[PDB]
Design a protein around this nucleic acid. Sequence first.
RNA 1: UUGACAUUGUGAAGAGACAGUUUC
RNA 2: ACGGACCAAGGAGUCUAACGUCUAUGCGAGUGUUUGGGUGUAAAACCCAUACGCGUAAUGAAAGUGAACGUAGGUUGGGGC
RNA 3: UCUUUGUAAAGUGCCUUCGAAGAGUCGAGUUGUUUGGGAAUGCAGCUCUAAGUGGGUGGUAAAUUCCAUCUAAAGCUAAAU
RNA 4: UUGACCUCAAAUCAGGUAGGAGUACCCGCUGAACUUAAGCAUAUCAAUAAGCGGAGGAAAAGAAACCAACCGGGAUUGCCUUAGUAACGGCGAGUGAAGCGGCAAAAGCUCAAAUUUGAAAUCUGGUACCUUCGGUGCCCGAGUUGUAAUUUGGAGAGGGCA
Lengths: 193, 148, 99, 52, 203
Amino acid sequence: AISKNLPILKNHFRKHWQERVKVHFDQAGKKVSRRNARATRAAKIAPRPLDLLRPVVRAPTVKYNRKVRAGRGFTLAEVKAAGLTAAYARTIGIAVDHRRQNRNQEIFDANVQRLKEYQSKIIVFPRNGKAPEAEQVLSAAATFPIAQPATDVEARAVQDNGESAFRTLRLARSEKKFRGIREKRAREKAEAE
Amino acid sequence: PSRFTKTRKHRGHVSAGKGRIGKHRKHPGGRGMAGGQHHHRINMDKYHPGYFGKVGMRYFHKQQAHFWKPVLNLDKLWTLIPEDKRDQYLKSASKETAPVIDTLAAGYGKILGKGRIPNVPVIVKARFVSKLAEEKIRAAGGVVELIA
Amino acid sequence: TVKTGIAIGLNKGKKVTSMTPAPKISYKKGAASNRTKFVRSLVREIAGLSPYERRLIDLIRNSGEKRARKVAKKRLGSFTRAKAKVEEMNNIIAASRRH
Amino acid sequence: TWRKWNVKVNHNEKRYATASAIAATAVASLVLARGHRVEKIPEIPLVVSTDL
Amino acid sequence: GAYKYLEELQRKKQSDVLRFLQRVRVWEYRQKNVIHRAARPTRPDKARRLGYKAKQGFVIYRVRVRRGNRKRPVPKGATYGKPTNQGVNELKYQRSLRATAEERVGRRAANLRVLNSYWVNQDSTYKYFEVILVDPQHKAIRRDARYNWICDPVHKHREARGLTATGKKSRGINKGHKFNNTKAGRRKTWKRQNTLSLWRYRK
RNA sequence: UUGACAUUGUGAAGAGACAGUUUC
RNA sequence: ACGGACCAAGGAGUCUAACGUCUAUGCGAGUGUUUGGGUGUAAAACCCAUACGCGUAAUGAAAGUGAACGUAGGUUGGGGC
RNA sequence: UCUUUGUAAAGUGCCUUCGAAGAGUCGAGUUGUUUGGGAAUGCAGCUCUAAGUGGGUGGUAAAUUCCAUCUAAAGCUAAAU
RNA sequence: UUGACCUCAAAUCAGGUAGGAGUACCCGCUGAACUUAAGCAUAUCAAUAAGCGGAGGAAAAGAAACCAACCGGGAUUGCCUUAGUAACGGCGAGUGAAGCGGCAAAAGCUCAAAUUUGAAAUCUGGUACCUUCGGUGCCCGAGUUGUAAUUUGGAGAGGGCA
Ligand SMILES: [Mg+2]
Ligand SMILES: [Mg+2]
Ligand SMILES: [Mg+2]
Ligand SMILES: [Mg+2]
Ligand SMILES: [Mg+2]
Ligand SMILES: [Mg+2]
Ligand SMILES: [Mg+2]
Ligand SMILES: [Mg+2]
Ligand SMILES: [Mg+2]
Ligand SMILES: [Mg+2]
Ligand SMILES: [Mg+2]
Ligand SMILES: [Mg+2]
Ligand SMILES: [Mg+2]
Ligand SMILES: [Mg+2]
Ligand SMILES: [Mg+2]
Ligand SMILES: [Mg+2]
Ligand SMILES: [Mg+2]
Ligand SMILES: [Mg+2]
Ligand SMILES: [Mg+2]
Ligand SMILES: [Mg+2]
Ligand SMILES: [Mg+2]
Ligand SMILES: [Mg+2]
Ligand SMILES: [Mg+2]
Ligand SMILES: [Mg+2]
Ligand SMILES: [Mg+2]
């Protein structure tokens, strides 16, 4: 029934919803279990740092392309430029992504330098021999954090030529909107001698 | 808590506040939005005009991220400079050394012109700008550079 | 080609330094090979034509390519496949008629 | 089971109440009223050496 | 090799050669039992590319299944409900006939595991299929690391659970926006989308 | 129950219209 | 007119999702630690990054555009000073 | 503590030709069902049935130009659930 | 006449395997109506209950014929969001995802299509012995209507050079 001045509600509770109620009573228990699992895995793989090194990539879409973030793995071109094979990089703790491609030089150099830093800061134990002392560092991400590149200086000179950025945007929008009809018009005008 | 509810006060009183005649029942007028066009019409038309019918055209598979464009007014433009360089820039308004404000980095898509910035030159980098916002920035002595 | 450097327009977007990644071996999934061209030619001259291919060739000879394309669009599922099939019938007719 | 059991409190209000409780520990009348036998304590707050 | 010629010639199903072979073979299959063992694959290249190998422990069965719709098995066509559920005749089974074929062969040969199947023939009444099966008990399969995965008990009756190629297609197991209802299992997706999730500190 | 397509192939006649096609 | 032979015990506006008005509290152009991580005397308490929600802009079906003539205006009341 | 092994195995740079990649399947029509998927989201039945600089997808049906992106019709795989 | 081959049989032949139970969770099939719409048929309940088949300690999914349209991301799963939104709906009642972003966990790969052709290099079984979750010798058999090595698109292969 409808009465009084109230917003129209859309509470979706017309199915057997009480059969599928999940209450996360186990939030604390699962946090403890995750911490125990991490401690167990760290002990099992010691002294490896519990996570692979990840590349820096640009987030897609207009909403997020202003930010960089960790990607899945380094490209084959990036690994080759760093001077090692993908098969060996995967064995020395480098995530490798065969399906990502490089079209951005700044990203490519950033990831190559990231691999150079990793290889400079890494110690690889010989396959057969006496291992030297090495304390376990747990986080490659904390050791090699992702940094947002600097886009501009803090302050500089005003260089104005009176081009009216608003007019620039208007004219770009108009040029795109009328690009097709102008091409057609030029096509028939060219055809008519 | 239950001890503060009118249910405790209604103990001993027959109808529990629901009335002897009206006599609280299950769904006397229907369930949910039943009767919006028939017997709840007056409430619908008085409190929710425009509820029934279609307006406009559909957009199949609309992605809200395409329309991401948060707005920043000129009167808040100077809050994108951290306060500890803010006063240093406010005094000595210099054309040769004017602060650069990257509004996209701050998380904005378009600069709007609610107006009255101080008469100090600034380089405002934005994806979009309103005509009045650009005129006020240029009047203050700055410039808008377009970025993507 | 290059991004203009503004948020709208024909080539909108940020101007970055391009790199032209090396070509994947995929993107050549549909490429023909000498092995496959030989196999397909031999199988075609072994098996011959389907009844609807015979009908298409007859229609090309009598009624023309427009009606042949219409019938091939009915038999296959799409206009683009009809055009490709009619072109292949035309090559068959030309090879059977030449010399 | 899906009755609400835990209650969210704003972090700042939690810190407000903690600060007030800490300051109340330094009021002799408040501790005595709360029920502690501090009638012969030298001074409140009571600070002892780090050797403890 | 010759498998490439076999692959290309099999695609010429309305050529005179294949029309003749299909008519003779369909009569031969119709004479035999509905399910019967095949001495060798009829299409060896197709069996190869579906995973068949000519070694002990690989078995081929041939099965025919009745074509057409699934008539709703209600007495006298009476459905006791609303008009939207009153249909009897134009209803379609949600699994393919090749899935029905695989399941009947697996029931016949419960000691084996259905690996794959392929179409071989059809007439108006029956579609004919050949099913590749692997014997999990044969030591030639228990060794040979490339194939002893199917000895794992989790692969019991995968044709019954829709884990073959036709089973995954009928289940709609594919990537992309066209399969939003069915990527991780449609009943699992429905449970996830219809679960009320409440936290300790209510959001 | 009636029509269409599929199952569905092979000879002729010959209504023909007209290298052949096409219904009959 | 209907229920009630008698007594004991049990016996009926609850919880949840979303929300309106009002009130209290914190902080305020911001606000929300508790998805998660850290930590722990271990489902508690304590601590925290990036995001995200709502808010700080509207309007149009939409493409779009987008808030100071002026002591942020004038007139009439207006508590207090 | 034994051991064995390089003419085993694997890896990398430059020049040349090449580079096989799944068919009653994809796809199309129609019927039923299903989906938020709307000139049709998936599935299935019947009919038709491809190609190889090809094919699929790019959420308004169609023709004509491009462009982007992946590589189906075969298969295995722990954890977080 | 004798010996093969193919196909099909028989045996209380040698050795195995399937069935049934449980079924909270999982993978499919089949499949309602009560109910709501203040009536009712599409719709809703609900792609649910009941019915049927099939697993495991998890299952399923899974290394893109993906998402996108960006300066691009990059197997699968799950949480927080997206969002009660785009959209569907006697456009009524109702219903209703997905991309991006933060996070938990992270892991990658295998066949078919290629002449070993100067050498079927492959495999079951039986038997004898032994260091017995197996190994070796011998033998029969399987297999060229193709068992090994080699390659899986990110590649990779023949040749040359190093
Ligand atoms: Mg009273
Ligand atoms: Mg009473
Ligand atoms: Mg009463
Ligand atoms: Mg009433
Ligand atoms: Mg009325
Ligand atoms: Mg109905
Ligand atoms: Mg009465
Ligand atoms: Mg009485
Ligand atoms: Mg009584
Ligand atoms: Mg009582
Ligand atoms: Mg392929
Ligand atoms: Mg059904
Ligand atoms: Mg699997
Ligand atoms: Mg026996
Ligand atoms: Mg009703
Ligand atoms: Mg009623
Ligand atoms: Mg009624
Ligand atoms: Mg059930
Ligand atoms: Mg078990
Ligand atoms: Mg699994
Ligand atoms: Mg692949
Ligand atoms: Mg993903
Ligand atoms: Mg919202
Ligand atoms: Mg629904
Ligand atoms: Mg090799």
